[PDB]
Design a protein around this ligand. Structure first.
Ligand SMILES: O=C(O)C1=C[C@@H](OP(=O)(O)O)[C@@H](O)[C@H](O)C1
Length: 427
């Protein structure tokens, strides 16, 4: 199959203008499609996940135009719930937010739509969301394995008292939050117990407000939503740079800098992954914050032991950065790595061992003891963009690394390797 071999990188230094945030991009696209008015999104991410959402909107009848680089999108709002019948199939690749958000949104009114995706998407749980949507009146059928896509949605979500489990994915709650305002009746969303990936809920609420809707958040345990609302175009909206994509470059500087500055995100960012910079600081790197940039300068790198539930994606970056740190690193409370693009705890543990680390793959944590020196490995990427980007960092050592299926990074960052190369220096 395809592979890319990265030669050793002696030092990293420079500036990266970040691609748009995937989390913000797909939420903004769905809200813009539901809203009244024309929304112009700028700095929109062009990646597989966004392309699947755009293809879904096209299939649903939403009109929009894209600039040549596909980063500017003018969306003609539908002015209400999107509709389609005839069991129209929407293929969503392995786009989590698109699948979860559309599964909820397309339950408004009457529809007859089927949501599906790549083989792995059919292994990513959606039962907690279906349970909540049904409590609100939705008619949903599992076409294959119970609790997983594909789903046939036949509408009927009207609102009311809805319970939702927030212990496996915050995406179910996000999906319900964006949908409930348009339901005819008021909705009270009660979180059953724990809520993981909490920062992403803040991203959802931020976008909802930008599009004219607010709800009552009672300490993240209950959300009171008024029904009969309408989303309104915010005019020209700037999509923040991707803080998860930034993690690789900031980590690269913490390991082999130099100073690397990423632009497009800053201290005011709504994304929880900007907190990744705080972890690098705890490890010994120096961080500089700006209004539209975050920079990291090499200091030292010491192992850490911390709960990473608040930054599940960027936390993967710490797992490979740990290869360069002094001591044993432990990342805890990351059980849901197991139900994402691949089972990331199994994948990360497996590939880290290939380059020489001693790794304990815990049920919901990972413990990494780096080797005195890394060795060459051909890294399997599990159709997971982040496995490829995380392991690209192995090249910040004396050894090259070969990354299988490098194009899997296109899920959220098509130009990843060219960008890493941009800050890679020989001296
Ligand atoms: O809401 C979002 O944009 C996301 C939330 C996270 O999922 P979980 O809530 O399942 O942890 C994250 O891993 C995913 O890449 C994007």
């Amino acid at each position: 199959m395809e592979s890319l071999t990265l030669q050793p990188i002696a030092r990293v230094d420079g500036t990266i203008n970040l691609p748009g945030s995937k989390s913000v991009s797909n939420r903004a696209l769905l809200l813009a499609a539901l809203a009244h008015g024309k929304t112009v999104l700028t700095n929109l991410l062009d990646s597989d996940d966004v392309r699947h959402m755009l293809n879904a909107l096209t299939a649903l009848g939403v009109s929009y135009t894209l600039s040549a680089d596909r980063t500017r999108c003018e969306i003609i709002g539908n002015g209400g719930p999107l509709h389609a019948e005839g069991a129209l199939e929407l293929f969503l690749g392995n786009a989590g937010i698109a699948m979860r958000s559309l599964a909820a949104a397309l339950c408004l009114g009457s529809n007859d739509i089927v949501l599906t995706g790549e083989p792995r998407m059919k292994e990513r749980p959606i039962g907690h969301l279906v349970d909540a949507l049904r409590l609100g009146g939705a008619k949903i059928t599992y076409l294959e394995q119970e609790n997983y896509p594909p789903l046939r949605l036949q509408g009927g979500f009207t609102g009311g008292n809805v319970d939702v489990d927030g212990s496996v994915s915050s995406q179910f709650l996000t999906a319900l939050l964006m949908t409930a305002p348009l339901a005819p009746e008021d909705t009270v969303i009660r979180i059953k117990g724990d809520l993981v990936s909490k920062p992403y809920i803040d991203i959802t609420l931020n976008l909802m407000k930008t599009f004219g809707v607010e709800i009552e958040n009672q300490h993240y345990q209950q959300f009171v939503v008024k029904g009969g609302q309408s989303y309104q175009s915010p005019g020209t909206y700037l999509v923040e740079g991707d803080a998860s994509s930034a993690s690789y470059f900031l980590a690269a500087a913490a390991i082999k800098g130099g100073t690397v500055k990423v632009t497009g995100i800053g201290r005011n960012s709504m994304q929880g992954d900007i907190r990744f910079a705080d972890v690098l600081e705890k490890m010994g790197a120096t961080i500089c914050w700006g209004d539209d940039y975050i920079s990291c300068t090499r200091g030292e790198l010491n192992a850490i032991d911390m709960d990473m539930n608040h930054i599940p994606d960027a936390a993967m970056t710490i797992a490979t950065a740990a290869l360069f740190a002094k001591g044993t690193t432990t990342l805890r409370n990351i059980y849901n790595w197991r139900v994402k693009e691949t089972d990331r705890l199994f994948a990360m543990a497996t590939e880290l061992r290939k380059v020489g680390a001693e790794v304990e793959e815990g049920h919901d944590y990972i413990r990494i003891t780096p080797p005195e020196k890394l060795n060459f490995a051909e890294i399997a990427t599990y159709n997971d963009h982040r496995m490829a980007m995380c392991f690209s960092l192995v090249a910040l050592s004396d050894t090259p690394v070969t990354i299988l299926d490098p194009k899997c990074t296109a899920k959220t960052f098509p130009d990843y390797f060219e960008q890493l190369a941009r800050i890679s220096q020989a001296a």
